[PDB]
From a paper:
Mutations of human CDC73 are associated with hyperparathyroidism-jaw tumor (HPT-JT) syndrome, which is an autosomal dominant disorder characterized by parathyroid tumors, fibro-osseous jaw tumors, cystic kidney lesions and uterine tumors. PAF1C participates in recruitment of histone modification factors and promotion of transcriptional elongation. To understand how the CDC73 N-terminal domain contributes to CDC73 functions and how CDC73 pathogenic mutations may lead to HPT-JT and other diseases, we have characterized the structural features of the CDC73 N-terminal regions and revealed a previously unidentified N-terminal globular domain. Here, we demonstrate that CDC73-NTD can form a well-folded globular domain, and is conserved from human to yeast.
LC-MS/MS analysis revealed that this protease-resistant fragment contains at least the first N-terminal 100 residues and likely the first 111 residues of hCDC73. We thus named this protease-resistant region as hCDC73-NTD. Furthermore, we have determined a crystal structure of CDC73-NTD at ultrahigh 1.02 Å resolutions and characterized CDC73 pathogenic missense mutants using biochemical assays. There are one and two molecules in each asymmetric unit for CDC73(1–111) and CDC73(1–100) crystals, respectively. The overall structure of CDC73(1–111) is almost identical with CDC73(1–100), with a r.m.s.d. of Cα positions being 0.894 Å. Indeed, our Thermofluor assay showed that hCDC73(1–100) and hCDC73(1–111) have Tm values of 46 °C and 56 °C, respectively.
Residue numbers in the entry: 1 to 111
Write the structure that this text describes.
């Protein structure tokens, strides 16, 4: 298996069933907690030697499952659910990666 975000991308591209049970997100045999950190850097972080920060799986999955909402409505929904938001400058790039428009991102740190 690759990293969790790459697995999420694979499942999304194939439209394979993803199971959310409690705080687990399940991809076939594999499971991660909702709060696992992905390798996608949050816009605005990692400047001037300061730490990079990363979106959680929950944050990314919540965006993916709510792509039909306008970004402003999505921001409000995310607040209601207490799930951190994907920042607007990351939205198009992250969704394009998840949908297989791209196979990497300048925001993904992956050795």
């Amino acid at each position: 298996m690759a990293d969790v975000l790459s697995v999420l991308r694979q499942y999304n591209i194939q439209k394979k069933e993803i199971v959310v049970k409690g705080d687990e997100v399940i991809f076939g045999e594999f499971s991660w907690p909702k709060n696992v950190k992905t390798n996608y850097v949050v816009w605005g972080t990692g400047k001037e030697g300061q730490p990079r920060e990363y979106y959680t799986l929950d944050s990314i999955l919540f965006l993916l499952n709510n792509v039909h909402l306008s970004h402003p409505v999505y921001v409000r929904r995310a607040a209601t659910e207490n799930i951190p938001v994907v920042r607007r400058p990351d939205r198009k790039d992250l969704l394009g990666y998840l949908n297989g428009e791209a196979s990497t991102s300048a925001s993904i740190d992956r050795s």
